[PDB]
C-alpha cells in the first residue's frame, strides 16, 4: 500500500526532471525550461496533497544530498513524523545509468552533479511549505540556508531562473509571519531581508536576466510602500533597470501598479493615470488575477476623484465586482453635488473598509475635491455669474471664502476664468476657437510616433521564431 504510493509520484517527478536536465546541458536552451517551470508550480501543488507527503522523502534518497539530509528530518519533525522504511538508502532508482546520475562516478567525486540537483532541491522544499502553511521556526531556518548557498554558487544564464522564483517565497513567508504575530524578532528579521535584496540585485544586473530582475523589483517596491519611504523609492525607479522585453504580462501589471501609488502622493496624476490603465490592460482577466484586478480597480477610481474628474457610473454597474465597489460609489455622488455633510457621513461608516487597503488617507484629500469639483461644474455651465450666487447653491460660508477657493484652482489651469472685483462677477476666460492654434498639433506629433512604437517592437518578433523553424528538417 504505502510502498506503491511512494514510487508512483517519484517516477513522475523524475520524468519532469529529466526533461529540463538534458536541455540545460547542451548549449543554452534555457528559454524552453522556463515554459516547463510555469506548469511545474501547478502540477506539483496538486500532487503534494495526493500520496501524502512521502513523494519528497524518497526523492532525496535517490540523488545525492549536499545539505538536504537534515532538512527533510527537520521538515518532518514539526509534523510528528510517522516512520515507515525511513532509514536512508531504502529506495534506489539509479542502478548505474547515465541519465540516472551514475553512482560510482558520483560517490568518487570525479564529477559534479550537485549544481543542478541542489538548486532544484530547494525549489521543491519551498512548495510544500506554502502548501502546508508551515510557519515559525521552519520559515527562519530555511532562510539561513538558501541565501548563503546562492552566494557560493555561480549562477549561469539558465541557473539564474532557478532562484528567481525562490525570492518570492522568501518575502511572502516573512510577511505572513509578521501579520500573524508581532514581536521583536520579526522587525530584526526584515532588516536582513532588506539587506539581501540590495546585494543580489547588483549580481542580477550583470547577468541581465529578465525574469530575475522582474521578480526582485516587484518585491522591492512593495517593501517601500509598507514603510512609507519615498526617497528610497524615488531613486530606485530613476535607474530603469526593468526589462520590458521577455518579462511576463503578470509581472508587468504589478510594475505599473506601484508607479500609480508613488505619483499619487506626489500630486502629479498625469503620469499616474496612465500607469493604472496599463496595469489593467497587462493583467489577465482570469480568476487567478482577480486579486490584482480587485485592488487595481479600486485605485483607478481614487486617482480620478483626485484629478477633479468624475469616473463613469457604468464601472460600478456592468462589472460583476460592484459588491466591493459600493463604498466608492457614495464618494462619487458626494463630490458632484458638493454636499459637505454627505461626504463626512460617507467616510464615517465605511472607514473600517477603507483601513484595509490604506485608502482612507487618500480620502482626506477628497474633502477638498468636493468643493473644487462643484466650482468647476458651475463655472463651465455659467460664464458670467455673480459672487453671492455660488454661496446660495453650495451653502458656503461667506463671500470672502468663495473668493479664495476660486483663485486656488486657477493656479494649475483648472477653472480657466478670471475674478473681477470691481464689477463683482466671475467671467469664464475660455472662448474655445483653439482649432486655429497650435495646441492640437502638439498631440498630433506625439500620436505619429505612438503608431510607430508598436512597429519596432513587432517586425523583430517575426524572425525570432523563424530560426529554429527553418533549421529543422521539413518533409
Amino acid at each position: 500500500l504505502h510502498h506503491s504510493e511512494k514510487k508512483y509520484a517519484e517516477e513522475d517527478q523524475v520524468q519532469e526532471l529529466l526533461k529540463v536536465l538534458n536541455e540545460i546541458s547542451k548549449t543554452t536552451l534555457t528559454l524552453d525550461p522556463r515554459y516547463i517551470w510555469r506548469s511545474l508550480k501547478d502540477l506539483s501543488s496538486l500532487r503534494n496533497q495526493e500520496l501524502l507527503n512521502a513523494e519528497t522523502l524518497c526523492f532525496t534518497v535517490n540523488v545525492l544530498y549536499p545539505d538536504s539530509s537534515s532538512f527533510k528530518k527537520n521538515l518532518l519533525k514539526f509534523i510528528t513524523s510517522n516512520h515507515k522504511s525511513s532509514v536512508p538508502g531504502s529506495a534506489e532508482l539509479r542502478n548505474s545509468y547515465p541519465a540516472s546520475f551514475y553512482s560510482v562516478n558520483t560517490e568518487k567525486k570525479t564529477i559534479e552533479v550537485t549544481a543542478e540537483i541542489n538548486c532544484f532541491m530547494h525549489l521543491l522544499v519551498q512548495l510544500f511549505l506554502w502548501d502546508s502553511k508551515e510557519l515559525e521556526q521552519l520559515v527562519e531556518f530555511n532562510r539561513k540556508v538558501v541565501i548563503p548557498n546562492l552566494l557560493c554558487y555561480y549562477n549561469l544564464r539558465s541557473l539564474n531562473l532557478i532562484n528567481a522564483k525562490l525570492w518570492f517565497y522568501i518575502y511572502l513567508s516573512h510577511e505572513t509571519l509578521a501579520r500573524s504575530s508581532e514581536e521583536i524578532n520579526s522587525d530584526n528579521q526584515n532588516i536582513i531581508l532588506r539587506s539581501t535584496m540590495m546585494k543580489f540585485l547588483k549580481i542580477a544586473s550583470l547577468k541581465h536576466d529578465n525574469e530575475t530582475k522582474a521578480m526582485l523589483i516587484n518585491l522591492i517596491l512593495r517593501d517601500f510602500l509598507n514603510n512609507g519611504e519615498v526617497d528610497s523609492a524615488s531613486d530606485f525607479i530613476s535607474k530603469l533597470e526593468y526589462p520590458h522585453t521577455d518579462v511576463s504580462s503578470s509581472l508587468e501589471a504589478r510594475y505599473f501598479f506601484y508607479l500609480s501609488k508613488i505619483n499619487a502622493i506626489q500630486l502629479d496624476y498625469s503620469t499616474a493615470n496612465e500607469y493604472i490603465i496599463a496595469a489593467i490592460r497587462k493583467a489577465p482577466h482570469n480568476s487567478k488575477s482577480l486579486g490584482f484586478l480587485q485592488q487595481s480597480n479600486k485605485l483607478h477610481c481614487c486617482i480620478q476623484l483626485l484629478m477633479g474628474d468624475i469616473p463613469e457610473l457604468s464601472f460600478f454597474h456592468q462589472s460583476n465586482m460592484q459588491k466591493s465597489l459600493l463604498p466608492y460609489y457614495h464618494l462619487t455622488k458626494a463630490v458632484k453635488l458638493g454636499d459637505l455633510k454627505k461626504f463626512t457621513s460617507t467616510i464615517t461608516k465605511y472607514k473600517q473598509l477603507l483601513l484595509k487597503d490604506d485608502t482612507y488617507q487618500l480620502c482626506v484629500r477628497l474633502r477638498s475635491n468636493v468643493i473644487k469639483t462643484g466650482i468647476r461644474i458651475i463655472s463651465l455651465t455659467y460664464k458670467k455669474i455673480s459672487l453671492r450666487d455660488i454661496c446660495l447653491k453650495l451653502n458656503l460660508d461667506s463671500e470672502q471664502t468663495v473668493e479664495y477657493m476660486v483663485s486656488r484652482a486657477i493656479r494649475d489651469g483648472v477653472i480657466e476664468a478670471k475674478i473681477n472685483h470691481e464689477d463683482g462677477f466671475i467671467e469664464t476666460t475660455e472662448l474655445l476657437n483653439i482649432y486655429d492654434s497650435e495646441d492640437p498639433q502638439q498631440v498630433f506629433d506625439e500620436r505619429i510616433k505612438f503608431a510607430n512604437q508598436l512597429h519596432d517592437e513587432y517586425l523583430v518578433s517575426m524572425r525570432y521564431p523563424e530560426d529554429k523553424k527553418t533549421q529543422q528538417n521539413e518533409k
Binding site: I310, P311, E312, L313, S314, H317, K333
Partner: peptide
C-alpha cells in the same frame, strides 16, 4: 455612462413642474 443611471436626480418629478402652470397666469 457618467452621471446617468443610478444617481438620477431626485427632483423634477411632480411638485416642481406642477407649480409652473400657475406661473403662466401670474404674468
Amino acid at each position: 455612462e457618467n452621471w446617468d443611471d443610478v444617481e438620477v436626480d431626485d427632483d423634477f418629478t411632480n411638485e416642481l413642474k406642477a407649480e409652473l402652470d400657475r406661473y403662466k397666469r401670474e404674468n
